[PDB]
Design a protein around this ligand. Structure first.
Ligand SMILES: CN1CCN(c2cc3c(cc2F)c(=O)c(C(=O)OCc2ccc(Cl)cc2)cn3Cc2ccc(S(C)(=O)=O)cc2)CC1
Length: 558
C-alpha cells in the first residue's frame, strides 16, 4: 500500500559528485549564464524520497477488465525465446555496474568463466526459489538541468548477475510483445520522423480533432504490486519455454513487485513496493501499464474515436472533439478514472486543438519548409536542457554524450543544426577526434556512433530535407530565442559565422569529413550546394534502432 518505507539510512554517493558548471572558455562560448546550469546529487536525495513516498489506492472496473482481456488475447499470439548466456552477455554495456560477487561488465562481455559460472548459479537459484526478495541498490542520479532546483532522481537496480538473467528470461519478450499488444500506440517502434508521421496523420484523420498529453505524478511510485503481477500475467500469455516461465514468475515475485533497498555503503535504506527504475522490464512494464489504464480511462470518459501514443509513462491522446465544453468535462472524467486506477495527474490535463501545442516525450510537432517550399513536419522540443547538458559535456568528460543523441533525434530543428552541430563539430576538429566513436543513448539503449556518419544517419532517419529546412514557425523560433536569452547563448549571427569556418575546414579534409561539411552546414552559406542522396545512406544497419524502449534496462547494441 505504501510505495516506500524507509529505515532512515541515507542514500549515499559512490564517488564525489559535481553540481556546479566549471568555467572554461570553450564551454563559455556556448553558454554565458553558467550559474543557471546544475547537476543533481545525493544531497537532494531526501527531497526526492518525500515526493515518491505515498500510499496508493486503486479501484478497478469493467473498462479496466475488458481492456486487459483484449491485451492478453493479443499477447497470446507471441512466441518468445530464452536468450543464451552469451547472447545476454553481449547485451551488457561495457561500463555497466560491476557485480558485488567479484567480476565486472568486461568480464561478462568477455565470457569469463567466473562471471558465467556465477550467472548460472543466480539463474538456478531463480528456478529453485521463487520467494526470497532479491537485493537492490538505490542511488541518486547525477543529471544536468537549468534552474527554474529539481531534487535528484532515484535509481533502483539489482546486481549485474541478476540483470544478465533478466536479459535471458525477458529480453525477447520486452523487445517484441509490447508492439503486438498495443500496435500503433506503442511509441518506441517509431523513429522521430515516424512518430511525427503517425501523429500528423492521426490528427488529420479526425473530422474535428482534440488532443491532450497526460502526466502522471511520479509514475513509477503509482505502480502497484497488483499492477506488476498483471504485467507478469500478460508476459505469461506468450508461448514460452518452461524455464522462461519459471524464471519470469520468480523475477516477478522476488524483484519486480518490490524488495529491500541497500545504499552505496551497504546499509538498509528501506523497502520498495512499486516499480523499480533500473530493471529490464521498466520500460515495457510502464508502457503496458500506462496503456491499460489510459485505454480503460478513455472508455470511462467515453472519448470518441480515440488514438493513443504511449512511451513508458508518457501519454498522448487524440480523439474526436465533442465540443469545447464537453471536451473539458470529458477530460475531467478521464482524469478521475486514471486516478481510481492509481495514476493521478501531476498537472491537470488540458484539451488542445492544435497538434503543435501538444507536448509528449518533452517534444512536439512543428512545421517548416524544404528547399522546394514544401511543408515538412518535424519533431522538436525546448532546447534548454539539451543546451545545458551540452555545456556540461563541453566543460567535463562524461561517458554519455547527450549532444550526439540530441543531434540524431532533433537534426531537423533550428537549434540542433545551428548550435549543437556547429559547436561540437568545431570541437572535434580542434581535438582531431572526428573519427572517434562516441556513446549515446537511444530509447534507453546505448549505441556507439561515429560522428562522421551523422550525415547518412540523418538522411536515413529524417530524409534529405533535414539539411534544407527553413522558414520555421514563429512560435518555435520565439521559443529558441527565449532559451538563448535565458541561458546566454549567441544568436544566429554568431553561429552562422562559426558554422562557415567549421564547414570550410571540414571541406579541406575531404572524405566523410567533407560530406559533413557539405550536408550539415549548407544552411550556413548563402550559395547553397545541391545535396543529392548520400549513396552510403542505404548501407547503414539501423534495423534495431527504433524497436523498443530500454530505459533502465542496461542494454548495449553494436
Ligand atoms: C518576431 N520574429 C518573427 C520572425 N521569426 C523568425 C525568424 C527566422 C525564421 C522564422 C521565423 F519565424 C526562419 O525560418 C529562418 C531561416 O529559415 O533561416 C535559415 C536557417 C538558419 C539556421 C538554420 Cl540551422 C537553418 C536555416 C531565419 N529566421 C531569422 C532568425 C534570427 C535569429 C535566430 S536565433 C533566436 O536562433 O538567434 C533564429 C532565426 C523570429 C521572431
Amino acid at each position: 500500500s505504501m510505495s516506500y518505507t524507509w529505515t532512515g539510512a541515507l542514500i549515499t554517493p559512490c564517488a564525489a559528485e559535481e553540481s556546479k558548471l566549471p568555467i572554461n572558455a570553450l564551454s563559455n562560448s556556448l553558454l554565458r549564464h553558467h550559474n543557471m546550469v546544475y547537476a543533481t546529487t545525493s544531497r537532494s536525495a531526501g527531497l526526492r524520497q518525500k515526493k515518491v513516498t505515498f500510499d496508493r489506492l486503486q479501484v478497478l472496473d469493467d473498462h479496466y477488465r475488458d481492456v486487459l482481456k483484449e491485451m492478453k488475447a493479443k499477447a497470446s499470439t507471441v512466441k518468445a525465446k530464452l536468450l543464451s548466456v552469451e547472447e545476454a552477455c553481449k547485451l551488457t554495456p561495457p561500463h555497466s555496474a560491476k557485480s558485488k560477487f567479484g567480476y565486472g561488465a568486461k568480464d561478462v562481455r568477455n565470457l569469463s568463466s567466473k562471471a558465467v559460472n556465477h550467472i548460472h548459479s543466480v539463474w538456478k537459484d531463480l528456478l529453485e526459489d521463487t520467494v526470497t526478495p532479491i537485493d537492490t541498490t538505490i542511488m541518486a542520479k547525477n543529471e544536468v538541468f537549468c534552474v527554474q532546483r529539481k531534487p535528484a532522481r532515484l535509481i533502483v537496480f539489482p546486481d549485474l548477475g541478476v540483470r544478465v538473467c533478466e536479459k535471458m528470461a525477458l529480453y525477447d519478450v520486452v523487445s517484441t510483445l509490447p508492439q503486438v499488444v498495443m500496435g500503433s500506440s506503442y511509441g518506441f517502434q517509431y523513429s522521430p520522423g515516424q512518430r511525427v508521421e503517425f501523429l500528423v496523420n492521426t490528427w488529420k484523420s479526425k473530422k474535428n480533432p482534440m488532443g491532450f498529453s497526460y502526466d502522471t505524478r511520479c509514475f513509477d511510485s503509482t505502480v502497484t504490486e497488483n499492477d506488476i503481477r498483471v504485467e507478469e500475467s500478460i508476459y505469461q500469455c506468450c508461448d514460452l519455454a518452461p524455464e522462461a516461465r519459471q524464471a519470469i514468475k520468480s523475477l516477478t515475485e522476488r524483484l519486480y513487485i518490490g524488495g529491500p533497498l541497500t545504499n552505496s555503503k551497504g546499509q538498509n535504506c528501506g523497502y520498495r513496493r512499486c516499480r523499480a527504475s533500473g530493471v529490464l522490464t521498466t520500460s515495457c512494464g510502464n508502457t503496458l501499464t500506462c496503456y491499460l489504464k489510459a485505454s480503460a480511462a478513455c472508455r470511462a470518459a467515453k472519448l470518441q474515436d480515440c488514438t493513443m501514443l504511449v512511451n513508458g509513462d508518457d501519454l498522448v491522446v487524440i480523439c474526436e472533439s465533442a465540443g469545447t465544453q464537453e471536451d473539458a468535462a470529458s477530460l475531467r472524467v478521464f482524469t478521475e478514472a486514471m486516478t481510481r486506477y492509481s495514476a493521478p495527474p501531476g498537472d491537470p490535463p488540458q484539451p488542445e486543438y492544435d497538434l503543435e501545442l501538444i507536448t509528449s516525450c518533452s517534444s512536439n510537432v512543428s512545421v517548416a519548409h524544404d528547399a522546394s517550399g514544401k511543408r515538412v513536419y518535424y519533431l522538436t522540443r525546448d532546447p534548454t536542457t539539451p543546451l545545458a547538458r551540452a555545456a556540461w559535456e563541453t566543460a567535463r568528460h562524461t561517458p554519455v554524450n547527450s549532444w550526439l543523441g540530441n543531434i540524431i533525434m532533433y537534426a531537423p530543428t533550428l537549434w540542433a543544426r545551428m548550435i549543437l552541430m556547429t559547436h561540437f563539430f568545431s570541437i572535434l576538429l580542434a581535438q582531431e577526434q572526428l573519427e572517434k566513436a562516441l556513446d549515446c543513448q537511444i530509447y534507453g539503449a546505448c549505441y556507439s556512433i561515429e560522428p562522421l556518419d551523422l550525415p547518412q544517419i540523418i538522411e536515413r532517419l529524417h530524409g534529405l530535407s533535414a539539411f534544407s529546412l527553413h522558414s520555421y514557425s514563429p512560435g518555435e523560433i520565439n521559443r529558441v530565442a527565449s532559451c538563448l536569452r535565458k541561458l546566454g547563448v549567441p544568436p544566429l549571427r554568431v553561429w552562422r559565422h562559426r558554422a562557415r569556418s567549421v564547414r570550410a575546414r571540414l571541406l579541406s579534409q575531404g572524405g566523410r569529413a567533407a560530406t559533413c561539411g557539405k550536408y550539415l552546414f549548407n544552411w550556413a552559406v548563402k550559395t547553397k550546394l545541391k545535396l543529392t542522396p548520400i549513396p552510403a545512406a542505404s548501407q547503414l544497419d539501423l534495423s534495431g534502432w527504433f524497436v523498443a524502449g530500454y530505459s533502465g534496462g542496461d542494454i548495449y547494441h553494436s
